[PDB]
């Protein structure tokens, strides 16, 4: 209910101004995580004990902020780009795509 979850985000390399730098891909679905971390923190939020305590403290004292909705599982993508010398570099970048969101 406006709770912590994965949201759409397509990263278009033209919109970032990286068209001349990145040969492939043209962009990619990164996603992002957003939403409130309510009490209680449900199983699929994969919370730490600390996020659980902070959530409880926040419900007693609003000055302590709530836990935060962040990626807890991410996957890799391949990229091809041009370096300083105009040479083609291949890289598999880890942790580029949000697969799961949780409260931390």
């Amino acid at each position: 209910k406006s709770s912590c979850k994965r949201h759409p985000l397509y990263v278009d390399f033209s919109d970032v101004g990286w068209n001349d730098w990145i040969v492939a891909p043209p962009g990619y679905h990164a996603f992002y995580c957003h939403g409130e971390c309510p009490f209680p923190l449900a199983d699929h939020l994969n919370s730490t004990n600390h996020a659980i305590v902070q959530t409880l403290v926040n419900s007693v004292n609003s000055k302590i902020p709530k836990a935060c909705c962040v990626p807890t599982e991410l996957s890799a993508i391949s990229m091809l780009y041009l370096d300083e010398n105009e040479k083609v570099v291949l890289k598999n970048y880890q942790d580029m795509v949000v697969e799961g969101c949780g409260c931390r």
Binding site: V23, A24, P26, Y28, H29, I77, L80, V88, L90, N92
Partner: protein, 93 residues
């Protein structure tokens, strides 16, 4: 399906890697696997830059041939699905 790709690295001497051969592709969990080719083209003269495996990429889904479809790029690229699919590559702007 994609278990191996043709491999090429023009920078092999600097990188201290291999130059040409076969590359096995490993996936995640139940992520697709792909091959890619990338090359330069000086007035009909094809200079291969890199070939190899490519991670799960929506731009490569269900492409059994490796074709660059962009108009006169400075560095040509294609990716595909299927064993050794980067062995031969084409250009259709």
């Amino acid at each position: 399906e994609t278990q191996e790709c043709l491999f090429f690295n023009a920078n092999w001497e600097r990188d201290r890697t291999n130059q040409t051969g076969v590359e096995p592709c490993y996936g995640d969990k139940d992520k697709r696997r792909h091959c890619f080719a990338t090359w330069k083209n000086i007035s009909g003269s094809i200079e291969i830059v890199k070939q190899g495996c490519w991670l799960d990429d929506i731009n490569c889904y269900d492409r059994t041939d490796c074709i660059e479809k962009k108009d006169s790029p400075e560095v040509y690229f294609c990716c595909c699905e299927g064993n050794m699919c980067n062995e031969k590559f084409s250009y259709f702007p």
